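Support case: user asked for a sample of complex input and structure output to validate their parser. Sending the pair below.
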Amino acid sequence: TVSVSIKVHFRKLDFPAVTICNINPYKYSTVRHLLADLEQETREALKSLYGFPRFSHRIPLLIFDQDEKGKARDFFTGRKRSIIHKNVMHIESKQVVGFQLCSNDCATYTFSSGINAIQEWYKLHYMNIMAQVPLEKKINMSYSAEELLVTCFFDGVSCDARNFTLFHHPMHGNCYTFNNRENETILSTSMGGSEYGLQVILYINEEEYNPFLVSSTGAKVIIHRQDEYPFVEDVGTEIETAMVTSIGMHLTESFKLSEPYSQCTEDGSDVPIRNIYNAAYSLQICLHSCFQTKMVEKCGCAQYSQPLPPAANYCNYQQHPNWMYCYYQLHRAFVQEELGCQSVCKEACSFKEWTLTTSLAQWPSVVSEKWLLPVLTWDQGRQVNKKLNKTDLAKLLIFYKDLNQRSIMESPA
Amino acid sequence: EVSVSLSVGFKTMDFPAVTICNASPFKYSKIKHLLKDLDELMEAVLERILAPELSHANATRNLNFSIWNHTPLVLIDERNPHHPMVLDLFASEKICNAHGCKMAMRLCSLNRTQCTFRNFTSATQALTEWYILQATNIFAQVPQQELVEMSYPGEQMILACLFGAEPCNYRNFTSIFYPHYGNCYIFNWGMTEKALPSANPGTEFGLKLILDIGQEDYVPFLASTAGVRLMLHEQRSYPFIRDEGIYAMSGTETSIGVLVDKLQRMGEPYSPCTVNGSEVPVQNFYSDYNTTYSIQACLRSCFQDHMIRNCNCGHYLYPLPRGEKYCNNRDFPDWAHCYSDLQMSVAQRETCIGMCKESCNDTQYKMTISMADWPSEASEDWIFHVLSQERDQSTNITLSRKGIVKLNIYFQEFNYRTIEESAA
Ligand SMILES: *[C@@H]1O[C@H](CO)[C@@H](O[C@@H]2O[C@H](CO)[C@@H](O[C@@H]3O[C@H](CO)[C@@H](O)[C@H](O)[C@@H]3O)[C@H](O)[C@H]2NC(C)=O)[C@H](O)[C@H]1NC(C)=O
Ligand SMILES: *[C@@H]1O[C@H](CO)[C@@H](O)[C@H](O)[C@H]1NC(C)=O
Ligand SMILES: *[C@@H]1O[C@H](CO)[C@@H](O)[C@H](O)[C@H]1NC(C)=O
Ligand SMILES: *[C@@H]1O[C@H](CO)[C@@H](O)[C@H](O)[C@H]1NC(C)=O
Ligand SMILES: *[C@@H]1O[C@H](CO)[C@@H](O)[C@H](O)[C@H]1NC(C)=O
C-alpha cells in the first residue's frame, strides 16, 4: 500500500508541443463541388419546416408521432398538427424528427428540435462522403500554415510556418503543431510571463465556413507532450475570433507506484494491443487503437473518426451498407465494458499535464483597430489584398505562469 | 531527514489583495498635447508603409525628424545575398515585404558612430516596439507627480463596488503608478490598514466590481488590447502585474474562483531560500513602497542596478534610487542602445537569477476563470441608467455601453491547501 506527496523546483524549463487547428475543417468553396448535391437535399429538407410547400434514400429522415411507438413516417410524406407546459415560450411538439439505422433489427435517433436533426443527419452524409476521399486531396484541400498564421514569436525570436509540423486530422483538416519538429532541439523558457512565451496571430475567414456544420468562428489549440497524440476531437481549448486568448499554464508532472492493486505500465509493452497512432503510449490511445481494431475485426472496415489500421478500408455506406448499425453495436458494447479493450488496457505510470489558466481580452482595441488591421494586411500583403475585418483574426498567447517543476510523487508504506 | 505535511479544506481567512489596471496607461485626451508630434510622425510612417501613393513631399517633410533621427526604422533588404541593402524609410514607391526583407531598428551610441540593427520579421511587431520605445523616451521627461494625473482616475474607472455585503467606493483602494499601466488600484492591500477577512465561499461573499474601461480615450498606437489587467497577490506585495496578471474582457461578467496554496522550503542546500530578503546584496529599490522582499523585486532592481552602472541612468519601467534619473535621450543620447545590450546579453539575465535568492513563505492564488455576456436584456437599460446617474456626478456627463467590465472574485468551496517541506 502507498502514500502521497507534492514537491516542486525552479529550473529553466522546456516548452510543450502546441497544436493549432481551424475549427472549420476545409475551405467551403474548395469542397463545395463534392457536397453541392447534399447541400440541395438539406436545404430542401429545411425548406420543409415552415414557409414553403438520392441521399435521403439511404438514411431516410423520419417523423415520429409521440402518440405511438414502432410507428414512423417519411419526412417528405404527409403530416399535420402541441403538448402543454408551464413570456412563456416553452412547449413540447407532439411530433419529432429523427432517422434510423438497420442491419440485414434497427436503432434510431430523435431530436428535441427539427433543425437539430437535419444538421446531425447532414453530418452523417458528410462523413459518408469524405471517408471516400484520399488523404493527399484532403491535405491539398485544407488550410496551409503560411495562410493560417499571420505572425508568431517566442521570447522575441521569430517563427515561420516552417517551424510547424503538419498533422492532418480526419475531422479538423490540416492541424499544425509547434515545437515538435524531429531532430531539432526542443524549445525552453528562462523567463515566465507572456512576452517570453509563444504569441501568434491566426487568420480565420468566416467567409469559407461551410454553413451546415454547427460551430463558432474560431480555432482549437491543444497542449501536449512532444511525443503525445492530440485527440483534437475531445480535449482542446477553443479560441474565439477578435480576442486575445492568454493561455497561462503551470507544468505538472505525475507519478504512481506499481502494485498488484495499483497497476500501470511505463511504455505499454505489457498489453497485446498494437498502437496505430504513431505516438507514445497512453490510456486513451490504447483504448481507441483497440477499438478500431475490434471494429475492423467485426465490421470489415474502420471508423473514419480515427486513424486507419493497416490492411483496412475507411467505412462508408456506399461500400458497407450495414456499417453504422455494426458501429452502434460495438460502441454500446464498449460502453457496457463488454469488449476486451476496457479490461486489458492500463494507465501510464507517469505523465505530464499543462494545467491551463485561460483568460480573454478584446483585440484590437477599438482605437487601435484603425491602423493595426491595415498593417496586419501589409504583413501577408502579397498573399492577401483585402482589408482584414476585425472578426477575421484571433490573437493567442501561450506562456508559463512560473518556471516551477510542480509534481506529485508517491512512497510505499 | 525530511518531513512533510498536506491538507485541504475551507476556513475563514484574509482575503487576497487584488489589483485593477486599465490597459491604456493614459487618457489620450489628457496627454496627447505631449504626444502630438510623435503621433503625427507615426501617421506618416504608417502612410509611408501602407500606401505611399497617397503621400506628398510637401505634406510629409514638415514632420519632426529630430524624433526620427534618434532611433529610426530601416528596411533591411537582403533578398540579394550577394549584396544586401539598408534603406531609411525617409513606378510605385511601395516598400518591400518579400521573404528576404526585414524591418529593423538602428539603435546607436557614441555620437552614433556605433550602431546595431534589431530585427523584427513583421511590421506589426516593429511599429509597436518602436512607438513604445519612443513614447517611453517622452514619458521619462515628465515628473511623476504630474504624470499620475494623466492615468484613468479611480473616480472614472470604478463605477460600482461591493465586498460581501459591505459598501465601497474608489477612495477605498490604494493607488500606485505602475509605470507600464499608469494608475493601478489595489484593493485590500493590507499595508495602510488591517486586511479584510471573508467568512464564506461563493460569489455572495467575494468582490463585486463594475468597471469602466473608457475605450474611447485609449492611447491610439499604444494599448492594443482592451479590458482590465487584473492580478491576485498577498498583502504588501508590489505586484508585478505586467507578467503575472490576468485579463478580463469588456461586456462580460468575468467571474474568478479562488483557491490558496502555501509552501515553505526545506533549506539552503535543497534550495537557497531566504526568509525576508535581508541577506541579498541587491538594493531592493522597491522598498520605498514598503513591500516585502520577493524574487521578482530582486530581479528587476538588479537589472536596474546594472543599468545605473553601465548607462549612468535608470530605465523608465523600474523605480529609481532616489539620487538617479530616468533616461531621456535629451540627457543620455545612447540610452536606448545601452539598454538593449542589457536586454540581449543573457549573462545579465542569469547573473541576477543567480544572485537573487528564492522567497520562503510561498503563497499562490490558483484561479478558475469563467464568463458570460453582460448585461443581459433583463438588466441593461435600468442598470445602465442607475450607472448613468453615477456618471452624471461628473462635472459634465459622459456615457458608453461598450466600455463596462463586471467582476466577481471569491473563494471556492474549499479555499486552502497548506503544504510543507521541513528538515528533521
Ligand atoms: C521636435 O519635438 C521635440 C519634442 O517635443 C521638440 O522639443 C522641445 O523643444 C522645446 C524648445 O527647446 C523645449 O522647450 C524648452 O525646454 C527647455 C529645456 O528643455 C526650457 O529651457 C525652455 O524654457 C522650454 O521649455 C521642449 O521641452 C522640448 N520637448 C521635449 C519633449 O523635449 C523639438 O523642438 C522638435 N524639433 C523639431 C526639429 O521640430
Ligand atoms: C492543391 O493543388 C492545386 C493544383 O496543384 C493547387 O491549385 C492548389 O493551390 C493546391 N492547394 C494546396 C493547399 O496545396
Ligand atoms: C512564514 O509563515 C509562518 C507561518 O506559516 C510564520 O511563522 C513565519 O513568521 C512566516 N515568515 C515570513 C518571513 O513571512
Ligand atoms: C530578517 O530575518 C533575519 C533572520 O532570518 C533576522 O535576523 C532579521 O532581524 C530579519 N529582518 C527583518 C527586517 O525582518
Ligand atoms: C512606508 O514607506 C514610506 C516611504 O518608504 C515610509 O516613510 C513609511 O515609514 C513606510 N511605512 C509605513 C508604515 O508607512
